[PDB]
Amino acid sequence: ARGPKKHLKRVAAPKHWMLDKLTGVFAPRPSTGPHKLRECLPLIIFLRNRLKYALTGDEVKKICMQRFIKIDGKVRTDITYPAGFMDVISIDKTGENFRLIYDTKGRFAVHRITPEEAKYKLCKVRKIFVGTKGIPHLVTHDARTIRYPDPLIKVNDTIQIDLETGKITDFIKFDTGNLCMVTGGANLGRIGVITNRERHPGSFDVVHVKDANGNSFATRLSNIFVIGKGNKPWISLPRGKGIRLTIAEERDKRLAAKQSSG
Amino acid sequence: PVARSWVCRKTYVTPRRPFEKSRLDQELKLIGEYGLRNKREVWRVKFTLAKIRKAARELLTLDEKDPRRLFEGNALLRRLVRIGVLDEGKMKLDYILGLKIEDFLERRLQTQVFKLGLAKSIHHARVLIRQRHIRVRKQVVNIPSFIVRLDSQKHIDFSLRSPYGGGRPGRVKRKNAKKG
Amino acid sequence: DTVTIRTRKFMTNRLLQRKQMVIDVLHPGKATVPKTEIREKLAKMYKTTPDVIFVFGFRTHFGGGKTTGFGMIYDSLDYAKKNEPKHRLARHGLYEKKKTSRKQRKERKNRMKKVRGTAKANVG
RNA sequence: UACCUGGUUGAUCCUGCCAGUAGCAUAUGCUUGUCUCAAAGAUUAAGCCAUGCAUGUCUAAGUACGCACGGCCGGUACAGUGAAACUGCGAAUGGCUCAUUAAAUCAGUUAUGGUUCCUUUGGUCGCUCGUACUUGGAUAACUGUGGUAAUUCU
RNA sequence: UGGUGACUCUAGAUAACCUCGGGCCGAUCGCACGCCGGCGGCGACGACCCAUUCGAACGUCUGCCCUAUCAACUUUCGAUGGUAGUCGCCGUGCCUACCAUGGUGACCACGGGUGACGGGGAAUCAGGGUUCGAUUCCGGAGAGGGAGCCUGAGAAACGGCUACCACAUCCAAGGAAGGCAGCAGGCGCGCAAAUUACCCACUCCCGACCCGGGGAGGUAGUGACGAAAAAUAACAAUACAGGACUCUUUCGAGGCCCUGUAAUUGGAAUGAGUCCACUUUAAAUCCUUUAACGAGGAUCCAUUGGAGGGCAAGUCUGGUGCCAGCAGCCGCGGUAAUUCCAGCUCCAAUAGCGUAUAU
RNA sequence: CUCUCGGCCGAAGCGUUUACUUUGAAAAAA
Ligand SMILES: [Mg+2]
Ligand SMILES: [Mg+2]
Ligand SMILES: [Mg+2]
Ligand SMILES: [Mg+2]
Ligand SMILES: [Mg+2]
Ligand SMILES: [Mg+2]
Ligand SMILES: [Mg+2]
Ligand SMILES: [Mg+2]
Ligand SMILES: [Mg+2]
Ligand SMILES: [Mg+2]
Ligand SMILES: [Mg+2]
Ligand SMILES: [Mg+2]
Ligand SMILES: [Mg+2]
Ligand SMILES: [Mg+2]
Ligand SMILES: [Mg+2]
Ligand SMILES: [Mg+2]
Ligand SMILES: [Mg+2]
Ligand SMILES: [Mg+2]
Ligand SMILES: [Mg+2]
Ligand SMILES: [Mg+2]
Ligand SMILES: [Mg+2]
Ligand SMILES: [Mg+2]
Ligand SMILES: [Mg+2]
Ligand SMILES: [Mg+2]
Ligand SMILES: [Mg+2]
Ligand SMILES: [Mg+2]
Ligand SMILES: [Mg+2]
Ligand SMILES: [Mg+2]
Ligand SMILES: [Mg+2]
Ligand SMILES: [Mg+2]
Ligand SMILES: [Mg+2]
Ligand SMILES: [Mg+2]
Ligand SMILES: [Mg+2]
Ligand SMILES: [Mg+2]
Ligand SMILES: [Mg+2]
Ligand SMILES: [Mg+2]
Ligand SMILES: [Mg+2]
Ligand SMILES: [Mg+2]
Ligand SMILES: [Mg+2]
Ligand SMILES: [Mg+2]
Ligand SMILES: [Mg+2]
Ligand SMILES: [Mg+2]
Ligand SMILES: [Mg+2]
Known part of the structure; x- marks a missing residue:
């Protein structure tokens, strides 16, 4: 293929976008930007699929061309703008602020933050x-x-x-005992305290992280993001506090919620 | 490239020996007793039971404390109890291997309509269902092979837009009343 | 006399200057309710006028009990004309499409491609 | 569903194949009422193609002296709408097919501390001791003379 | 100064250089308008360099079908390595000069074949396997066959150009113009495959762009490739072959339950169709929803294969007479054919079922 | 496994090297 590619097949889009199969052949194809293509959330996906503020792509364009969306404090009129980890999306017309934080299941959750916390x-x-x-x-x-x-x-x-x-x-310095989130791999979205980092010169370094429930998991060094100093995060965490439930306890929680409903 | 899906399955399998007295007689007994259209319905029920038995047999060989065994075994048992095939007092995995084809055939909407007294025969039940006289809860169900859920059984009525439930005479009654 | 309107979902699109909702219509013995009177019911329910209400995507369930569609109520008619898709405005009579065909325009374009500057306007 | 059955002999037990049995794909035959999905000139010829279409693009913000409209005022350099043309960008994506290709392609894993990178995003952009209250020449659109049987020729 | 496992890295200091086919150091546009005689807020374009994103391009390690009636191959025209350079975006025999004689192979080199684009995957399958993968996702290659280039950040681009080879169009005979393995469509080839339709409304892409364009794509048309659901009747009364069940002593009684000749009756229920109106949709169609009409041979009439064995179902009747034919195999037919040609009956699957071929 | 370093541990080697087995990480979507 001569020159760069400009399209993205819908089935070839990253799975954490949660795109269906029958809506179309193509996917939004994030624009080049501060975040990598596989690790970003395009503005159209967030504004239409996540928040349901728009029903079609043309409505997303109509929203963005009135200069209502701000990404990290700057107006962004590109509907395929790549918004990624820790980005702050502000809509002043309706008056809400979101921070793109990975959920426990490795997907960008809709996480509303206070306007005081949207300044950094x-x-x-x-x-x-x-x-x-x-x-x-x-x-x-x-x-x-x-x-x-x-x-x-x-x-x-x-x-x-x-x-x-x-x-x-x-x-915050990268050291054992500091809270961190995993931004890639199998443990993506998990929050825990760094326990130990083992160095393999000429290769990848492995970091061990222990949850608040006592569970431990390893990742590569490039997949670790320091969130807070010690046990206290410097940002607000999503509803799931970064701990991963097994499918059994998730089913039990769902059943308990069903029983308590009504 | 198109925006279509191509996932599809065959819901039945065909027997390897086409002509044998015992299999033919047993299938005919099932067809006559449950008012089935052909042998493909029997083979469809047989195929679902075979898939269930295969899943259970796969799970049995696993360790008892294996989380996968616990998870999918619980799911399978709850699905089988939910449609009424299994008893809640027999909610162990091995009991799945004790299920028969008649258990799955008894949960059809046709047989349940016959058993509830809405129809005077299994064939009358089939024609009643296919003629939009039968509803489950508020939804008019048109499909005889509608596996009735255990909770959904208590709501099977005559479809209040129908002559038998809603008291509106049909084509024949109206025409014969116009003749008077 | 027996036609009920309920709105399951509801949100105020302040950025698109409207309210968007899911409409379910109960009409036990009648055909699918026409949009023109669902609009009247919605206007009376939300204390607005029917000219700013746009409804679409009405699908009637098997057995003929209920229909489900989507509705938008705009804050003003000018906002609706700015934000609505053109075909939905044409349904209300507020927009008219050009009468040419794709073949007509494509052949005219390929004919114009063969001539220099001002003569482009002399071919049609 | 971890399965077999007919055929060598006067008869028997074997070897052993032939035949039967079921699925799956292409074609074909007879038949066909409802409804939901849905493959479809690959195989032979990466053989040959009539015709039409498939790639174009303007914002408040590069260049408007086309009255082509329309002024408001009429010397207010330039109101506005704006064809055309110059400039800029794209046309290297997409679509099609499977001829070539046998450690080649490709796959997983690594490397670029051995390179290039329009664009987006952030940094940098008085860091240099040396007519400006604005410089020069064209060319297109347009107006007019044309040539060729003939072209998106000139 | 800072960094890495590892720099001949980053930064610093010094002497110079700095290409006329030149490197940056703004002679650009819009909107609001202001303050103190000059200063200015938002933007938009442009720009050397660094980083970032999107990549791309070379490499590392392991992995591929058949074939020995291919056993030695490469090296004189680079084969393997060394030194210096040229070229290239760079590392490199990439190329050159001079050297050295190396490099691969029965652990299958080299050569040949493939009805070979490679994967994710598909069919079948107890377990192990066998076969398929042109085909919508990823990667590669090509645009009739070779070759060479321009522009550009990015082509050795073909809906760009220049030639030659093969075809082929118009011509006033001087000349000009070509490339459907894009969408439709035609020819040809064949056992073998659909409309010269509608639309940018959805998914997305492009552009100076909220606005234009898109045979990408979507929507219909054809469509028994294939997959899902699912009609072709149900009931009551009679009358009974009738049967079970039941007392009685055989009849009988037993009128409880079932089945069927029922060209016996009887009203009920319906959708296939016809067809208003909605709803659907960019506009429609379909489906769904609802008026009206719409079933007794309910003629609104189910077929495709069989009936000796394998293998389920007639050594019933008529015709033929080793003929015609059937028969996957064994066999049947020579005047009483359970096998052919038919009638009747029967059975297998059933809106499907035979046949040929690959597996 | 131990002798050295830093706050009894964290570090360092190397026990000849593995094969094997178990775990962890990285591994497109369909
Ligand atoms: Mg391409
Ligand atoms: Mg490294
Ligand atoms: Mg012998
Ligand atoms: Mg014999
Ligand atoms: Mg065989
Ligand atoms: Mg057969
Ligand atoms: Mg129809
Ligand atoms: Mg094709
Ligand atoms: Mg071909
Ligand atoms: Mg131009
Ligand atoms: Mg650009
Ligand atoms: Mg370009
Ligand atoms: Mg910049
Ligand atoms: Mg060198
Ligand atoms: Mg050398
Ligand atoms: Mg040499
Ligand atoms: Mg080939
Ligand atoms: Mg292959
Ligand atoms: Mg293929
Ligand atoms: Mg081929
Ligand atoms: Mg491809
Ligand atoms: Mg190419
Ligand atoms: Mg060709
Ligand atoms: Mg070329
Ligand atoms: Mg072409
Ligand atoms: Mg091309
Ligand atoms: Mg074609
Ligand atoms: Mg032919
Ligand atoms: Mg065909
Ligand atoms: Mg469109
Ligand atoms: Mg458009
Ligand atoms: Mg297409
Ligand atoms: Mg049609
Ligand atoms: Mg067929
Ligand atoms: Mg089918
Ligand atoms: Mg119908
Ligand atoms: Mg027959
Ligand atoms: Mg016969
Ligand atoms: Mg037989
Ligand atoms: Mg038999
Ligand atoms: Mg035969
Ligand atoms: Mg026979
Ligand atoms: Mg996968």
Whole structure:
């Protein structure tokens, strides 16, 4: 295939979008942006499939062209804009704010946040490099580069960004005992305290994480996102508090809710 | 590329020996006793029972404490109890292997309509169902092979838009009354 | 006299300047209720006028008891004209489509492709 | 449903195949009332093709002296709608087919500390000690003379 | 300064260079308008470089069918490696010069064949397996066959161009124009496969773009590929072959229950059709919903294969007479044919069922 | 398995190397 591809088959779209099979052949094909194609949520999917504010794609376009949607404090009129982890979506006309946080089953949940909490976000740091007359530079998972960071900030750390200004306010160092979320793999969406990190030089590093219920699970280092310092998260967690129920206890909970209903 | 789905199944299987006295007699007995149209209905019920037995046999060989065994065994037993085939007091996995074809044939809407006294024969029951005289709860059901759920059994009525339930005379009564 | 309207789901689309809902219609012995009178029932129920109410997708269940569709009630007629799809406006008589065919336009385009600047307007 | 049955002999027991049995795919024959899904010029010829269509695109925001409309006022440089043309972008996606291709393609796993990357997103953009209250020449659209039997020619 | 497992990395310092076929250091547009004589808020375009996204391109490791009537192959025109370079976006025999004689193979090299695009997968299957995968998702290749290029971030692009080869169109004979393995459609080939329809309303894509375009795609048409559901009658009364059940002593009685010649009766219930109106939809159709009409041979009439065995169901009747034929196999037919040709009856599946071929 | 480092543990080797077995991670959707 000469040149880049511009379409996305519906059955070839990422499964966490929860797209059906009979609506069409194609999928929204996220635009290039701060988040990778497989790990993002396009604006149209969120605005139409998730929130049901629009019934068709044309209605999503009509919504976005009145400049009502803001992603991390900036008006975004692109309906296929890739909104990813920890992004803040603000709709002032109706007055709500959402944070894209993975659910326990590895899907972007509709998570409403208070307007006070919509003024900042947390970003994982991807690399630090010195350039241009010895000025340090940070690169985050959100593709934003910040010059003059705190010298203590190292790779795999987490920084709190004020969305209005774009500057760092504080940070969490990657260390055992700090709370984290898994942003990829089998344990995606799970929240727990880092227990141990084993280093394999020349290969991937494995991080062990223990839930609040005592369950343990491993991931790769690139799949770990520091959420809070110690046991306390710096953001609000979704309704499922990051713990994964087995199918048996999920069925028991569903049956109990059914019995208590009515 | 299109936006269509191609998943489909065959609901029955055909017997390997086409002509044998015992199988033919047993199938004819079932057809006559439950008012079935042909042998494909018998083979359809046989196929569902065979799939259920295969799933149960797969689960039995697993460990008792195996979470998969517990989960799908509980699901299978609850599905079988829900449609009335199994007894709640016999909710162990091995009892699934004791089920027969008549148990699944007794839960059809045709046989239940006959048993409830809405019809005077199994064939009268079939023609009553296919003629839109029978409803389950509020929905008019038109399909004789409607496996009646255990909770849904108590709501089987005469379909109040029908002459037998709603007291509106049909074509024949109206025409014969116009002749007077 | 026996035609009931209920609205199961309901949300205020403040961004699209409307209210959107799911409508279920009870009509035990009659044909599927025409949209023109479902609109009147909705207007009387929501204390608005029928000119800003757009209903669609009405499907009647087997056995002939109920119908289910979707409805929108716009805050104003101008908002409806901005936000509604054109065919739904044409159903209310507020829009008219062009009378040409796809073949007519395509052949005209391919004919115009053969001439230079102003002569493009001289072929039809 | 972990299955067999007929056929060598005067008769028997074997070997052993032939035949029967069921499914699945293509074709074909006879037949066909309702209803829901639904494959469909692959196989032979990646053989040959009439005709039509399949890729174009303007915002408040690159260039408007087409009265083509319409002014408001009529010297208010340029109201607005705006064909055409210049400029920019796309046309490298999609669709089709399976000829070639036998460690090749492809699959899983790794590498680029060995490279390129329109676009989107963020950074950077008085960091350089050296007519500007705005520079020059064209060309298209348009107007007019044409050539060729003939072209999206010029 | 900072970094990595590992830089000849990042940053720093110094001496210079800096391509006329030149590197950045804004001579651009719109909307609001302002303050103190000059300063200015939102945007839109553009731009060197870095990062990011979308990739792409080379590599690493393991994995492929048949064939020995292919046992040695590559190396003089790069085969394997070394040194220096050229070219390339870069690592590399990628190419060149000079060197060395290497590199693969019975653990199947090399060569040949394939009715070979590879996978995800499909059919069958106790367990193990066998076969299929042109075909809607991913990857690859090609646009009649080769080759060479322009533009561009990205083609060795063919709904771009330049040639040659094979076909072929118009011509005023000087010239010009080609590429359906896109959607329809035609020819041909065949055992073998649908409309020269409607639409951008949905899914998405493109553009300067809320607006235009899209045979991508959607919707109908044809459609017994195949899969799901599912009519072709039900009941009552008679009358009984009647049967069980029942007392009586055989009849009888037993009128409880069942089945059927019922061209015996009888009213009930219906959808197949015809057809208003809604609903559906971009506009429709279909389905669903509802008026009216619509069943006694309810002629509103079920077929396809069989009836010796395998294998379920007639050594009944008529015709033929080793003929015609049937028969997958064994066999049947030569004047009393359970096998052919028919009638009647019967049985298997049933809106389906035979036949040929692959498996 | 132990001798060294950092706050009894966390670290470091290496026990010859594996095959095997169990676990964990990474593994398109259909
Ligand atoms: Mg392509
Ligand atoms: Mg690495
Ligand atoms: Mg012998
Ligand atoms: Mg013999
Ligand atoms: Mg055989
Ligand atoms: Mg057969
Ligand atoms: Mg019909
Ligand atoms: Mg095809
Ligand atoms: Mg062909
Ligand atoms: Mg142009
Ligand atoms: Mg662009
Ligand atoms: Mg381009
Ligand atoms: Mg930028
Ligand atoms: Mg070199
Ligand atoms: Mg060399
Ligand atoms: Mg040489
Ligand atoms: Mg081939
Ligand atoms: Mg193959
Ligand atoms: Mg294929
Ligand atoms: Mg082929
Ligand atoms: Mg493909
Ligand atoms: Mg190509
Ligand atoms: Mg061809
Ligand atoms: Mg080419
Ligand atoms: Mg073409
Ligand atoms: Mg092309
Ligand atoms: Mg064609
Ligand atoms: Mg022919
Ligand atoms: Mg065919
Ligand atoms: Mg469209
Ligand atoms: Mg359009
Ligand atoms: Mg198509
Ligand atoms: Mg038609
Ligand atoms: Mg057939
Ligand atoms: Mg079928
Ligand atoms: Mg009907
Ligand atoms: Mg017959
Ligand atoms: Mg006969
Ligand atoms: Mg036989
Ligand atoms: Mg027999
Ligand atoms: Mg035969
Ligand atoms: Mg015979
Ligand atoms: Mg999978």
